[PDB]
Amino acid sequence: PDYYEKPFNPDGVTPGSYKGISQIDPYWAMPQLTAGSTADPSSEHFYE
Amino acid sequence: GRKLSDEQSALIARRDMEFRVKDNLVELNRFKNVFGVRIALFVVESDDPDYYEKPFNPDGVTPGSYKGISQIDPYWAMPQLTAGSTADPSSEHFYEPDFWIISGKKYHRSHLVVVRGPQPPDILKPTYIFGGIPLTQRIYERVYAAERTANEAPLLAMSKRTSTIHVDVEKAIANEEAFNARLAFWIANRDNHGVKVLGIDEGMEQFDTNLADFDSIIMNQYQLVAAIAKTPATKLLGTSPKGFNATGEHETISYHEELESIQEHIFDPLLERHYLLLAKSEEIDVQLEIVWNPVDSTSSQQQAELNNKKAATDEIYINSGVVSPDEVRERLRDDPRSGYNRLTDDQAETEPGMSPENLAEFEKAGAQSAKAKGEAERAEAQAG
Amino acid sequence: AAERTANEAPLLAMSKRTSTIHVDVEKAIANEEAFNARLAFWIANRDNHGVKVLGIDEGMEQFDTNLADFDSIIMNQYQLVAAIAKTPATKLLGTSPKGFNATGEHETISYHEELESIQEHIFDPLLERHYLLLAKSEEIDVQLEIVWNPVDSTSSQQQAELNNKKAATDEIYINSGVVSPDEVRERLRDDPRSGYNRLTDDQAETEPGMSPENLAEFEKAGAQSAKAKGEAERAEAQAG
Secondary structure: OOOOOOOOOHHHOOOOOOOOOOOOOHHHOOOOOOOOOOOOOOOOOOOO | OOOOOHHHHHHHHHHHHOOOHHHHHHHHHHHHHHHOEEEEEEEEOOOOOOOOOOOOOHHHOOOOOEEEEEEEOOOOOEEEOOOOOOOOOOOOOOOOOOEEEEOOEEEEHHHEEEEEOOOOOHHHOOOOOOOOOOHHHHHHHHHHHHHHHHHHHHHHHHOOOEEEEEOOHHHHHHOOOOHHHHHHHHHHOOOOOOOOOOOOOOOEEEEOOOOOOHHHHHHHHHHHHHHHOOOOHHHHOOOOOOOOOOOOHHHHHHHHHHHHHHHHHHHHHHHHHHHHHHHHHOOOOOOOOOOOOOOOOOOHHHHHHHHHHHHHHHHHHHHOOOOOOOHHHHHHHHOOOOOOOOOOOOOOOOOOOOOHHHHHHHHHHHHHHHHHHHHHHHHOOOOO | OHHHHHHHHHHHHHOOOEEEEEOOHHHHHHOOOOHHHHHHHHHHOOOOOOEEEEOOOOEEEEEOOOOOOHHHHHHHHHHHHHHHOOOOHHHHOOOOOOOOOOOOHHHHHHHHHHHHHHHHHHHHHHHHHHHHHHHHHOOOOOOOOOOOOOOOOOOHHHHHHHHHHHHHHHHHHHHHOOOOHHHHHHHHHHOOOOOOOOOOOOOOOOOOOOOHHHHHHHHHHHHHHHHHHHHHHHHHHOOO
């Protein structure tokens, strides 16, 4: 029910589950920032 | 990956002949450029009243049902949006019209083939009624400007010089119908090597106009028009504009590349769908693929040293054994540009590298080897 | 800026020439509708070879505008526009701008360089993940990657002269035994620009140096060697 919410795992691929490619305009998507990404600049994942 | 027999080749050839495929392709591209969106419909006769309602089924084709291709102008059809198409941006078919209204008849999207020009953003799609950006909208203003600038020059040239004289107009209007007659006589008989006589209190002056700058403006406008249409000016105008280089080395390359892009994008899907439907309609149990001829066009000479260069390469390969005498034969047979196009059904040598000279030395080397082998054994008779 | 500057010139060309006449306006407004009629007749029938009659106290004067400077401005603006887009102007406008030399050799190289930069950066990760996920979904238990075709575009003459030069390289290595005839046949098969795409499933000779002429000289040298050795023992049969 929440596969996209979990982090990606290649081992979870169901045969025939792949359907196609979807592209979204920027005004339909709103990014969300967590406390982990804004912890300290020493983190490799700072500000995305 | 192999060549089909002659009977179905002739069948497909004639079928395409009475279907006017090339006309359909040309009109498709032309009206797509003109209107920004074009609709292609494939007519297939079925007994189901709602065959077009159901999504297209490849296996639903009945023999001999196909009839041809029809194209619909934008102002006849009316798109319709289902709830799923406008459900959420996550869908792969967001803002994709899944139904079209043509004179009250419903057609599913899968049954149609729609080609689009430039793609507007999603928010601008409803304004364009889910269509591409028209080229006429992009070009009409500049076309008008260029045409008006071109037309203006002869009008100024026709009135380049004006001549005026001064005279006591009171005495002129005192008794005219003779003053006018005299001046009309002068105008009628006016030329060089004649003398005009005036009084001491009058004068005469002339004015001109310099027209030595219109050409640059006209050529700049025409160059801009050529730039808008993504076509070299040497085709629209038939000559490079004045003062511009006419090397055309990269221009022809870019034009050929654009033509290849058009071939890949617009003509490929309709042709693929047509050929699939035709093959399924006439019991053709072979899968078909489309290969395009080279877009570059050359005169007879360039063809001559084109063919010779490949011929030289072929001899290098066959003597080295990498290729065989046969596989070059049908390669030449498949190429229509090759000079030899009336080939028979005869077959050449199939073994790789067995040239007539290579085959000649095949037996000569082996035969001498046996003689050499026996001689050593014959030498072994003595000293033993 | 470039578009408005381009649009300005034809309008000024339309309004290039201005003509004026000085008359006694008081008399003209004393009784018009005939002055207007006469002037309208003059405008309607105006051309060269015609003469205009004026009073002794009147005068006529004309003006004109020089429009020989717009072209350089327009081409400079368009050159800057093409510079911003990191694409040669010869493709945006179709020709090199006025006054700029048109060698164009290095600009094609720069555009090509930007082209494989785009190919490596934008297109590569999406397509790579797509192929990985397709392989996982379609139970294809083979690891695969992506290799890119050359970015340049060539004509028939250029392609033919390209293939001919490569053929010489193939022949020189085969005679020296660097590569095997099949190992270049497969390369010839996979090349898209190569004419030979109808190759069958047959396999050619597999070990390097074993060329059709290298066949013949091999057995003769091999066979003649045995003959010479046979004579060696035959010769030594006598003299001891």
